[PDB]
Amino acid sequence: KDPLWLYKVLLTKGIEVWFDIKLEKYGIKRNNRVDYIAKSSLQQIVFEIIGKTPKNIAVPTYIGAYEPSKPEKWEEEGIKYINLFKPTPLMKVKPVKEMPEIVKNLLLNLFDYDAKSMGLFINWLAFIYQYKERTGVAWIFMGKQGTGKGLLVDLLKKIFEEHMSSNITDANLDSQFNPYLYNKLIVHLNEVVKNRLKTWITDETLYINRKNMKEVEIKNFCNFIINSNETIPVDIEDSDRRFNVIECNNVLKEQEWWTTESYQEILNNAEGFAKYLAGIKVDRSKVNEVVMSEKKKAIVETTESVLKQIAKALTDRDIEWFLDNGLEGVVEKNIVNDFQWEELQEAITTGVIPNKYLMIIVEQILGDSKTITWIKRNIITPYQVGETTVVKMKPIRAIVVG
Amino acid sequence: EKDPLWLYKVLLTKGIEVWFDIKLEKYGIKRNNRVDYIAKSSLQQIVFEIIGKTPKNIAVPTYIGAYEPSKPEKWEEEGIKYINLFKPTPLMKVKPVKEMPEIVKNLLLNLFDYDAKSMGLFINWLAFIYQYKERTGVAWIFMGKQGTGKGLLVDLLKKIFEEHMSSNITDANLDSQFNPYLYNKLIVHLNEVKNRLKTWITDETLYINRKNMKEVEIKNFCNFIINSNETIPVDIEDSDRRFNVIECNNVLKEQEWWTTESYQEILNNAEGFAKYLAGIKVDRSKVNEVVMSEKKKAIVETTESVLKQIAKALTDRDIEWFLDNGLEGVVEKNIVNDFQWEELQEAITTGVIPNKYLMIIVEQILGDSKTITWIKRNIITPYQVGETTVVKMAGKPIRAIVVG
């Protein structure tokens, strides 16, 4: 008669049930809680609610989708959708112009009373809180322990609730399942997958596999915060566009304002901090902004290969890089004359290096004797420094940069 | 039917509480302080035995199971209705006692080597777990040799906590795809993964995967006890706030008061020990307190990199660290005259070290000749010791590193 009678009677009781062809499960949405259950589970629910087990579930057929920018239901290309994003209490919160003070001292302690980066991080957080999109930039908090990184992720975890992943470590990565990425606005990882993570930052779609559900490709809303107590947590390239790095070495127990209860006082102020974020006026040009802090510049120049730097010093004829790396030791160990010591650095700046001097340079930077064949296949050829050639210096075989 | 909770009420008469758990799609049955999650066909076999008939529809409520000792047996938050899965074991509902049974006191004195401050700090930690039933964010590592009583202290606490404790979790259970040893536990004991464990101590939520149950995120109540007979059981940073370390080298067979029966006499005193913990006056400012015992400081400085210690010595211009590590050998091998041996130390103390001396210093500490490129890529640059630059000393322009 009416194939949606049960759907309507449960809506009166504030309960919205549909069938999700995509997962072959029934969706039930209660009081800011969306569950996916099998039919036999849903039949047990409606018997408790309406006193009878219908043999046929008279409910509509929607496609579940987690999109926080869209209505409770919408449709596109004829297929009708129902939304799986339901905000937690502390996202539906009245704005505030200024944040609770003990929360303000926690972040100031984290950012070392630097306003530009702390304000840039809060602008990033506020954007996630208000606009609920993927930013494509992640924040790495590192340094020492007891600095507040663990608290700020428990502070945000009370704000974002089910939409945040807390302390995902290699134990969950080794799992065949992906639950920490399914319908999340923030994903926290503890300690750090060099490319597995760098991809998640800018992916729109991930394959979500979770236990007793179909493996499904959903759109990606994850923003990553990464805590690490190692000196070099990840390999970062010099052209990077994904990572902001903040090193904090101020321990919270050693500060003026800290008590034992401050950990739970800061946590019991989650409402105030959420109300602050709700009131930030976001600058959308600076959510995907990364800055090259000298801690990040430190991570990059320890990470990038030394053979790459030799090749690029060779390319830019940067004699000053070689002498910063101790090339002048070649003369005090009398490997080279004072006459030949000026021919050798002439060869670097000139971009025409005889095989004789090519080995002298590489062996003094690297600290072991390398052959010309090795130098070409590990420094010259892969980084395209130049061509090995006969040059009229007598016929000297040299490499000409270019 | 008439009342879609008729069956629920009739089993409560027999003292039996059954619900349906939307979160696990299983039926929960709670009997005599012990909770099961079963399939529908199993629960129908249970109620047939109780009421003599098999209902077609299970007239029971729909709750969400949650393990929170702070909350009532049922409650609600938002519209969602909850039922509690924590039900304390007998020796948690027991009348306190002001003083501990004697044979249990000699074990803890023996474990802690008759030091009261550290033993009392551990009992204060235990008492907090017993009285307040929360996660402390601090773990205890018992170390040393074998027969000291650490294993017995774990069977003693396992009789108190029973179902709320995980006993002798080893590498076999970690390699399993399942997590049952962390599901609804107040104490978790590990026998003998540096970051997997350092995170569990301070996490609020774990993803619990168990055999025939859905993988589900639950609240974390675990406090960790760690036994190990290796000299360096874990890597500990100097700023650590999670670990207390106790090394014990008193074997119990070698002590005066020990007999064959002492092992099971201590075990038959679980009630007396539980009542003592119930009566401890807890100081909560000291439950998450960690102390750096001389064994912990050994673990820290065995673990931290030599390049980090060099980099920090360079930073603090601590000439005495270098000579503590034998830098003066540079003079006994006549690598250096008596005169640059004075430039080399003032170069360290001034924080301005010519490349010439920087390689001499590093080679005598590390024991192999390293290049300037290597020193910057592994000591200078990563720990931000300073900038390599041309500095004008005397008349020549000397390449140096300026600490700052």
Numbering used by the authors:
A (entry chain E): 305 to 496, 507 to 707, 710 to 718
B (entry chain D): 304 to 495, 507 to 718
Could you give the paper's own sentences about this structure?
NrS-1 polymerase is a multidomain enzyme and is one key component of the phage replisome. Here, we report two crystal structures, showing that NrS-1 CTR adopts one unique hexameric ring-shaped conformation. Although the central helicase domain of NrS-1 CTR shares structural similarity with the superfamily III helicases, the folds of the Head and Tail domains are completely novel.
The A-form crystals were grown in P212121 space group; per asymmetric unit contains six copies of NrS-1 CTR monomer, which were assembled into a ring-shaped architecture. The helicase domain forms hexameric ring in both A- and B-form NrS-1 CTR structures. NrS-1 CTR forms hexamer in both A- and B-form structures, however, as confirmed by the size-exclusion chromatographic analysis, NrS-1 N618 exists as a monomer.
